[PDB]
Design a protein around this ligand. Structure first.
Ligand code: A4F
Ligand code: AKG
Ligand code: MN
Length: 432
């Protein structure tokens, strides 16, 4: 396989024909005011130690990301990538001053790229011959900031299909975005085919290593845009240059189950089955209808694994840049605590003498999948907090396996290990 750069005559026609949805707006087209401001913001944020490598999970393997990052965006919003839920350090939509200033900066960058994107989608629709679709597909709600110093890596991976050389980030799609939403990137480089010293973004068509890929050079302050279905039909990578580089990748996160407000509302829904006169250990339930119980235990898992464990796995490295999620995480944890009491109550009702076995088996069938999953995921999370590489990470932001309590701890109604309880309930349902 081979690739094209501006050095090739075919590059330009290839781009115009097979990539009308990829746009480049060079540093020139953006005000020097903005450049200085966002570059300063990157640099303060780096100096404050705000960007972290993530301890992600891909195809069974625990991996540190070579790139270090921080998520910034709408308050209460989250972005899930490579099985890791990033929580926004918030920007001032309708903290240590400096850090708050940088977030405001990236908010205005966001406004600018949003305008540019709408503009480009308008021109794109015009060449193809509804403005709600356009504005929603450009309504960026977060940006994921990236940093890599390539001299810090002992050995970089070779781009395997087209000879593009060294890769900072492998071929992928930006995942979990609103359908056909655009992606806008501000690239900031600290400065026989593609020049190894310059950073490039690479592109290929999915499934296809015969059509030569493109490597677009990125100089300081250059911006690129992926429009409409480009991010789905094509893969992209990042090709390392000689110097360090920052980037700001503004996206429309699909967040329909990804906001604080959403998960709080799910918790409230589970707790509608609970007599709520008073908050004590005496949890009593309004109903034991299978469908209501299933839902409650499903929500129990949702808040526990998508929110609590995800959050605390990141070693609380937010209080380094914000405390916005502190009380929300305390509130969710308490809501999850009550839900522990709920599961206990359901177990108590199952073991109760005087319950017709038909109603007992109706309940078991409703909750077994949830308690099973709660066991399996709890093991995964516990392993993932010990493991090989979790060893190394600085104790100042190393994975905490929260919530966690010992067998001896009697502030909690149930044990962390549910294996006994799962076997016992699975046996009863087979009792013929
Ligand atoms: N240790 C690593 C962990 C993750 C990735 C990586 C990927 C590695 C493999 C892959 O198929 C997709 C990847 O997508 C990424 C997206 C990001 O925003 C950041 C990193 C990746 C990589 C990589 O780029 O090869 C290495
Ligand atoms: O930095 C870029 O240009 C693309 C962003 C990216 O691939 C990433 O790190 O998620
Ligand atoms: Mn990317």
């Amino acid at each position: 396989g081979s690739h094209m750069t501006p050095k090739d005559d075919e590059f330009y026609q290839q781009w115009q024909l097979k990539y009308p949805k990829l746009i480049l707006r060079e540093a020139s087209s953006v005000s020097e005011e903005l450049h200085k401001e966002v570059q300063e913001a990157f640099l303060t944020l780096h100096k404050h130690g705000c960007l972290f490598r993530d301890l992600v999970r891909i195809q069974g393997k625990d991996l540190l990301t070579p790139v270090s990052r921080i998520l910034i965006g709408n308050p209460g919003c989250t972005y899930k990538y490579l099985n890791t839920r990033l929580f926004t350090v918030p920007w001032p939509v309708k903290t240590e001053a400096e850090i708050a200033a940088a977030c405001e900066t990236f908010l205005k960058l966001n406004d600018y790229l949003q305008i540019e994107t709408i503009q480009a989608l308008e021109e794109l629709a015009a060449k193809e011959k509804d403005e709600v679709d356009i504005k929603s597909r450009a309504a960026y709600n977060v940006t994921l900031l990236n940093f890599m110093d390539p001299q810090k890596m002992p050995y970089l991976k070779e781009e395997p299909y087209f000879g593009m050389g060294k890769m900072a980030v492998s071929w992928h799609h930006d995942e979990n975005l609103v359908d056909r939403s655009a992606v806008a990137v501000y690239s900031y480089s600290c400065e026989e085919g593609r020049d190894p010293d310059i950073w490039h973004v690479g592109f290929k068509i999915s499934w296809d290593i015969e059509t030569p890929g493109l490597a677009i050079p990125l100089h300081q302050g250059d911006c690129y845009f992926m429009l409409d279905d480009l991010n789905a039909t094509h893969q992209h990578c990042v090709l390392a240059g000689s110097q360090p580089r920052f980037s700001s990748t503004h996206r429309v996160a699909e967040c329909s189950t990804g906001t604080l407000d959403y998960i709080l509302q799910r918790c409230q829904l589970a707790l509608q089955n609970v007599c709520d006169d008073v908050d004590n250990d005496d949890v009593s339930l309004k109903s034991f209808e299978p469908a209501v119980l299933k839902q409650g235990e499903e929500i129990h898992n949702e808040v526990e694994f998508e929110w609590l464990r995800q959050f605390w796995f990141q070693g609380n490295r937010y209080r380094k840049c914000t405390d916005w999620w502190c009380q929300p995480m305390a509130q969710l944890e308490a809501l999850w605590k009550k839900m522990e009491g709920v599961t206990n109550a359901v177990l108590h009702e199952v073991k109760r003498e005087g319950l017709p076995v038909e109603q007992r088996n109706e309940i078991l069938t409703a909750i077994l999948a949830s308690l099973t999953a709660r066991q399996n995921l709890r093991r995964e999370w516990h392993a993932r907090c010990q493991s090989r590489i979790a060893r190394t990470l600085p104790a100042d932001q190393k994975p905490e396996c929260r919530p966690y309590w010992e067998k001896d701890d009697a502030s909690m109604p149930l044990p962390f290990d549910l294996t006994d309880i799962v076997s016992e309930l699975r046996g009863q349902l087979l009792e013929a």
